[PDB]
Write a protein that binds this ligand. Structure first.
Ligand SMILES: O=S(=O)(c1ccc(F)cc1)N1CCOc2cccc(Nc3ccccc3F)c2C1
Lengths: 12, 252
């Protein structure tokens, strides 16, 4: 259930 | 939410070419100057044998991590692309899940040397025989053939920038909620790419670009071979494959 894209997209 | 979600003027398209080339330059992972300089640095017969003697799971883990590192640079490229951050999160993830591997497959032609059919891998250049332990020879041969075909086009860095922006911004991807916004951004990026080719007398490359079905076929083969490997070594995938790789290719 790995979800990383949302973290990369929201990290600024 | 962005100028490029509507019709853009010629001056706005010129501004888009520059923005895309900038986004690519700042996220390209490896410098073209480095890749060309390292061409003379080739794995020895001893080193090739060492990679062939690695276990299938060890080689899959290494290649999955190299792909994930490449994909992380594509995610940053997408984030810098005009209009991409103004799309909804559902659509950004649809576009990245479908297109990040396709962008890596295009970018990798820079690291491929058509003179001796070698790729830059783990510090040196090696042929497809370097990957023999993976047990997916057709997929490796297909990836090498693809890089060879793109190498024959003699792409500039700016052409790769514009072509990869268009690979990513594809309004046909299933699952897009704001399809009309993506269609307009794609239209403007298509104009930017074609404008640049027109200006540089490089329009002849358009008929030579690979069909979309070719990138799709490579992505499908990778997922198919991964499913075979996962059946053989499920705990290697569960315990040692990168989380982003699993999110993109094995549904989490
Ligand atoms: O391992 S790589 O050096 C490589 C370089 C050249 C090849 F033909 C193969 C690997 N790296 C960079 C090239 O981008 C790609 C592009 C595609 C795939 C992968 N990996 C991969 C390959 C096979 C199985 C699982 C996998 F994950 C990578 C990863």
């Amino acid at each position: 259930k790995h979800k990383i894209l949302h973290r990369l997209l929201q990290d600024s | 939410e962005n100028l490029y979600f509507q019709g853009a003027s010629l001056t706005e398209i010129e501004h888009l070419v520059q923005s895309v080339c900038k986004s690519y330059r700042e996220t390209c992972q490896l410098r073209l100057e480095d890749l060309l300089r390292q061409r003379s640095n080739i794995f020895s017969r001893e080193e090739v044998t060492g990679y062939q003697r690695k276990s299938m799971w060890e080689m899959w883990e290494r290649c999955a991590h190299h792909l994930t590192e490449a994909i992380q640079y594509v995610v940053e490229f997408a984030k810098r692309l005009s209009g991409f951050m103004e799309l909804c999160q559902n659509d950004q993830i649809v576009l990245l899940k479908a297109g990040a591997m396709e962008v890596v497959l295009v970018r990798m032609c820079r690291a491929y040397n058509a003179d001796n059919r070698t790729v830059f891998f783990e510090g040196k250049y090696g042929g497809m025989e370097l990957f023999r332990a993976l047990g997916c020879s057709e997929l490796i041969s297909s990836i090498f053939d693809f890089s060879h075909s793109l190498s024959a086009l003699h792409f500039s860095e700016d052409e790769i920038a514009l072509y990869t922006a268009l690979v990513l911004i594809n309004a046909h991807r299933p699952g897009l909620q704001e399809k009309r916004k993506v269609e307009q951004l794609q239209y403007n990026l298509e104009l930017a790419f074609h404008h640049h080719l027109c200006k540089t007398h490089r329009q002849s490359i358009l008929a030579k670009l690979p069909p979309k079905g070719k990138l799709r076929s490579l992505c499908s083969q990778h997922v198919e071979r991964l499913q075979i490997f996962q059946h053989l070594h499920p705990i290697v995938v569960q315990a040692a494959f990168p989380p982003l790789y699993k999110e993109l290719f094995s549904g989490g």
